[PDB]
């Protein structure tokens, strides 16, 4: 399978996977979980989500 790639200076229809930062826990940092913005300390608990 020979894959070809084109690099014309034009609006690219495919770039790749958008890189997401690591999960910084136990520290007051800014978070953006698909729209949900703000600042808080990411800590887990024993809640049961649906």
């Amino acid at each position, epitope marked *: 399978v020979v894959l070809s790639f*084109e*690099l*014309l*200076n*034009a609006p690219a229809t495919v770039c790749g996977p958008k890189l997401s930062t690591d999960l910084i826990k136990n520290q007051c940092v800014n978070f953006n979980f698909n729209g949900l913005t703000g600042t808080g300390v990411l800590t887990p608990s024993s809640k049961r989500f649906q």
Partner: antibody
Amino acid sequence: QVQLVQSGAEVKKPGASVKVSCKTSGYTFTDHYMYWVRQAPGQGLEWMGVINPDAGSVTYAQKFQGRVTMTSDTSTSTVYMELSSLRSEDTAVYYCARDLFFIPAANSFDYWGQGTLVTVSS
Amino acid sequence: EIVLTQSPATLSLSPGERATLSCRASQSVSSYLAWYQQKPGQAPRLLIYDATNRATGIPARFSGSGSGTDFTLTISSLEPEDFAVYYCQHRSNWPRMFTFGQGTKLEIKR
């Protein structure tokens, strides 16, 4: 036989837009790189102007980045060039040539058109 | 971008001799060089592509050469319908760039 027929002369005011076409025929116009050149009187031509007819990818030079915009039509098999902000040094004959290789590859020009004399004056 | 410099820029010879057309680049580019033949008044025509292969319709009298930074075009026998300006095009690799030279006039020596 591969042949590229262009339009005739077209005089335009210094500040309007020019629309010059490049009709291609004689071959399967699906996978072939289309280029554009223009030999200035006394000077030469130096820019790529490669446009993908099948896809919507375009490529311009450095001196002409936001002044020229090209488009293709897979139905009529004819590309169109739109050069805005016409200067007094661009009044020359515009040519459109094909490529020797296909879209993934690239090579020199093999089939040339006929020319389109464009003038910007009174 | 890689610029092309032509020192002779002219060649006055008689029909029957060999041409000494040159095309030198700035840096140490590869052999991706292609010459042209544009008759004054008519449309340009490809002469030699990739500097190592013969194009279609071109007779056997045209035979180019060169490697890296020393390119030359040697014609076997000059023809009266082959006296025109010759341009060489240099292409880049990554940003789909194409650069042209200045051209060398070939007038009939008289």
